[PDB]
Amino acid sequence: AFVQSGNKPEWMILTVLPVLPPDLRPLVPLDGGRFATSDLNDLYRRVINRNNRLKRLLDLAAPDIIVRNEKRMLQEAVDALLDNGRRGRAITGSNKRPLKSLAD
């Protein structure tokens, strides 16, 4: 199947992650001076926080344990973004309800 098609095997390992446009995930105001949940942006901010953390720690040459832990956390963040729940434990913001990953 691989050789028949034009897909290299290693493309199953993500190196660059696309982001959904903004308007398809609009930030609806609640008119109480605040904003609603809009959890997709929450997952995106989470993964970006992990990414920047790892970027800094890689720049500053920390001991391998720290970078390994942070890369594990980043892997979990991407897992949450692409499909939340298929891993051992889902993540929630409140109400003990899982958020809506793209696959959901």
Added chain:
DNA sequence: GGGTATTCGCCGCGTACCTCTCCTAGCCCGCAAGTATCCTATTCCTTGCAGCGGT
């Protein structure tokens, strides 16, 4: 190895509509307000030095 049994984990479970409510938690730093305190006067008394009539 190999045919078999047993277990684990994922997938699925009706349509359309109406009413209501509620939507992150915790720290922190500027900041308004309210206050107790400190310096500011007046009246009495007893000193210490510079002018000053007087001779």
